Design a protein around this ligand. Structure first.
Ligand SMILES: Cn1cc(-c2cnn3c(N)c(Br)c([C@@H]4CCC[C@H](N)C4)nc23)cn1
Length: 259
């Protein structure tokens, strides 16, 4: 009976659906991604490579006909998105802890040559202890193989989170794009709002940021220390943008915080 699972509820939709399943014998819970049914093949393949505390674990996949069944780590705390109070954000110490965990997960992925490509609060899930877990590898790809980097050219992601070079350049490096989206996530956690619809020349809010008008929202709501880190992350030129090893040296990143 240990292979029997009960589908107890729908966790959400994407894009098929994701259901919560409980083992009839052990009562273990697992998220099941159901796809009706090339893209799915890649998602499973990348998933098989993943083994990190801040990345959703992959348990396997069953194929009952035309429907694909991805068995993944269940995150009972739901989406980080739901911990962000609109127009407020969340307490700075909470935002810092989630940011630390997000960087740990991203460093791990980059170390194995994988880029997520769609980092945002809806994809960052929380377990029963509020530990952050990067989810959904349907848009993920290999950017380093046999120690040789491959440039990306495919448009993908979510506009408010996408780095400016995606929209402007034919090819671009993978890592700075994920760094940028993490900076937008940090902004959202500390301000409860996204800074711009997209980082384009045509976007007034993006121009304001480039002109350093930090007396305007959402910047005005962010303390000087984390704001200084955002100044280093949200840099238009990806070659000048701060790297993760340097984010780890940042003053705010290393500031002891307590609620
Ligand atoms: C791909 N994947 C999902 C899971 C997953 C695990 N827990 N979980 C919870 N609690 C919710 Br709410 C969602 C919803 C499922 C619909 C999309 C939402 N972003 C997240 N997905 C999940 C693990 N891997």
């Amino acid at each position: 009976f240990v292979e029997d699972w009960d589908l107890v509820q729908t966790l959400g939709e994407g894009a098929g659906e994701v259901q919560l399943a409980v083992n009839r014998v052990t009562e273990e819970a697992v998220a099941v991604k159901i796809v009706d049914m090339e893209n799915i093949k890649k998602e499973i393949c990348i998933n098989k490579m993943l083994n990190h505390e801040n990345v959703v674990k992959f348990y396997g996949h069953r194929r009952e006909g035309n429907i694909q069944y991805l068995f993944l780590e269940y995150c009972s705390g739901g989406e980080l998105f739901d911990r962000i109070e609109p127009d407020i954000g969340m307490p700075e110490p909470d935002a810092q802890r989630f940011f630390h965990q997000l960087m740990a997960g991203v460093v791990y992925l980059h170390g194995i040559g994988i880029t997520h490509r769609d980092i945002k609060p809806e994809n960052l899930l929380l377990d029963e202890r509020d530990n952050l877990k990067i989810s959904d590898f349907g848009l993920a790809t290999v950017f380093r193989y046999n120690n040789r980097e491959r440039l990306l050219n495919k448009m993908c992601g979510t506009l408010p989170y996408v780095a400016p070079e995606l929209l402007k350049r034919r090819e671009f490096h993978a890592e700075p794009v994920d760094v940028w989206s993490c900076g937008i996530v940090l902004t959202a956690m500390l301000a409860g709002e996204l800074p711009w619809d997209q980082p384009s020349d045509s976007c007034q809010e993006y121009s304001d940021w480039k002109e350093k008008k930090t007396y305007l929202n959402p910047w005005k709501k962010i303390d000087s220390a984390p704001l200084a880190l955002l100044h280093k992350i949200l840099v238009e030129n990806p070659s000048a943008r701060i790297t993760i090893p340097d984010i780890k040296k940042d003053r705010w990143y290393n500031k002891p915080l307590k609620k």
